[PDB]
Amino acid sequence: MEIDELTALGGLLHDIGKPVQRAGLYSGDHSTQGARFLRDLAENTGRAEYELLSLFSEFHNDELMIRRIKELSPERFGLTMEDVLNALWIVYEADNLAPQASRPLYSVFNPGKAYPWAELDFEKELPVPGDVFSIRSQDYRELVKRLWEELSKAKLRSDRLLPVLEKYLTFVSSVTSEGNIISLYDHMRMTSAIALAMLRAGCTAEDVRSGRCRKEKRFLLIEGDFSGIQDFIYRVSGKGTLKYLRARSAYLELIGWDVVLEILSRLGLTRANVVFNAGGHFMIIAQNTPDAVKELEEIRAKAVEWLYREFESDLYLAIEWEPVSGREFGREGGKNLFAEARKRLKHKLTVRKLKRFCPVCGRCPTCNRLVSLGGNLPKLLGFGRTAKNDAGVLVEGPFSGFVPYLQGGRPVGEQILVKNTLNPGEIPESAQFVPYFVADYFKARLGVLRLDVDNLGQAFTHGFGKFNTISRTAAFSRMLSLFFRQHINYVLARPKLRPITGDDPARPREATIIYSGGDDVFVVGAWDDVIEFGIELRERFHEFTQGKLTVSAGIGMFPDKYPISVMAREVGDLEDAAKSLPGKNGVALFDREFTFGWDELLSKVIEEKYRHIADYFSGNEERGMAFIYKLLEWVYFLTPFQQFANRLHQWFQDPTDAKQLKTALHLYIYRTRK
Ligand SMILES: Nc1ncnc2c1ncn2[C@@H]1O[C@H](COP(=O)(O)OP(=O)(O)OP(=O)(O)O)[C@@H](O)[C@H]1O
Ligand SMILES: Nc1ncnc2c1ncn2[C@@H]1O[C@H](COP(=O)(O)OP(=O)(O)OP(=O)(O)O)[C@@H](O)[C@H]1O
Ligand SMILES: [Mg+2]
Ligand SMILES: [Mg+2]
Ligand SMILES: [Mg+2]
């Protein structure tokens, strides 16, 4: 076993004893039960490398440590006694830099509610924060049962170990204090990320005991961010199908993964070093060495060069890095060092962005390939990442060709990106497994929705400063991604809100997501499903975040040959109107700019004014079209049922009741006419 695998896997598995001990498997602390576990794993199956990795749990110089490394005889794995010792000290420091066994993981949005334990990657039914229900020993026993089975089967490799730990430890508290918001998965990968970085920075056991890795700028915080996305995605003509736009959006995800995996490859890191990769905006923990810097400088130049030659200024990737000490991953309490670091890095990226300078495409050959991919997306299981002009390459990024992995075909590549599953399954043993998750929902006018989280920046930096360490930032980012890449699927598949449309058979929405990720959604479909979807999505989000974040939205309606370019800008402007309301939390309903609170649109506009008109004009002779049109144009001169007219009259005073009413009348027209 190689020293870099030793360190990265040791960092992942150093804390494996915690569910073991919470299940009561053996006896002693988690350090003791974790080592016994991995040793049982080694001896039960035959993979001796689980023995050597049991040492990392056994900590977390002493006679006993030395004697123990000697018993293990690391030479049979091709390591020296000194090697294992340096790794054990490195992981020990990585864990430092990154009370009652029944406490669950508390919610990031309210440290008063908490998740019951659940396994990921199965009917992902919005595990949201309920009241404090301590976790049973027997829950952990079922956890350890699945853990053992999947650990038994998985390659002893970061790309295969990571997804097993994510599957089962995402809703396990890392430290059972109350109010703890860091999952055990988040802590393990952060430990692994920082330990591998320390190894690549050359940190030794001497640097660790001296405290030099806490003090000195041994790490880089790398941050990348695309700009120009709206022009890259939505600048297409009338020709340009919905399929074509979905491929366009999926292509940009590939372009960002190409850069990320090139950085990990070139610097010698693991997917664990990816703090997050959300909306074409990523953060990576790396070593601060001269070599790594000049790798980064070359990757950046290449990616920027490729982007400009492929699409000129239509799409720009800004990459920056910030040297930081291990101490700057954390707060030091009244220091807020990590927050300071993030804001220097944000300022550089800001600066880097100022330096940025076909019938469908504008500029087509890449447009031909996106149509092809557009056709294939219902059966696409993922993408093989390979040499640019290898066989099967459909589209290219700055560094690689991507081969579509289809339901029939055979996966091909050195990295295989696999869609919406943590199970590597089909792929070859040699391949680097890279799971990615996307909201891939797919069913007189059509409806277009843009929803976007209000003030997302401020929450990461201050918000509700509970996220001012690297691990809490990873925990916050991940929860958010869980909403926008998975939970939004369920809302489209199993909706419950149909005030406009009828309940009748519970039916999926007539809609397709063009993109959902980071903190933004772009959705099209039948115009009333799209309205009901925006509201129901906002309410799920409101319950998911316990009201600590809000969202604003735009819903436009459009004829059929309408250019997508104009559609996107027009709804963005409606979203602008909703953002520019004080307090943001709102929605511009239709291509005008009267704007409503979320709870007032549903309860007042929809379920008070609108169905007042709808109930009392149902299948009625004298067409409500006649009545509403002239009413859209004194009160008893204008003269319905006395009780019908009078409720209308009291609404037409001067309040906000008048303007909601007009939107409600507008709704009747669009629903009923023709
Ligand atoms: N693959 C994708 N498809 C569609 N939209 C995406 C994709 N990736 C990111 N986005 C969205 O695009 C938006 C960003 O748009 P754009 O790049 O035009 O401006 P910006 O990123 O705010 O500018 P800057 O990067 O300078 O801050 C984000 O809301 C993000 O959610
Ligand atoms: N899951 C996530 N993890 C980490 N960062 C994210 C995530 N989702 C979005 N972001 C980032 O948060 C920021 C959102 O910026 P945006 O331009 O939408 O403003 P914001 O802070 O919410 O202000 P506003 O309320 O106007 O949207 C961007 O930096 C985006 O890349
Ligand atoms: Mg921009
Ligand atoms: Mg936002
Ligand atoms: Mg946004």
From Swiss-Prot:
One of the record's GO molecular function terms: ATP binding
Activity control note: ssDNase activity is inhibited by EDTA.
Required cofactor(s): a divalent metal cation
One BP term from GO: defense response to virus
Similarity remark: Belongs to the CRISPR-associated Cas10/Csm1 family.
UniProt note: domains: The N-terminal HD domain has ssDNase activity. The C-terminal GGDEF domain has the cOA synthesis activity.
Protein name in UniProt: CRISPR system single-strand-specific deoxyribonuclease Cas10/Csm1 (subtype III-A)
Organism (species): Thermococcus onnurineus (strain NA1)
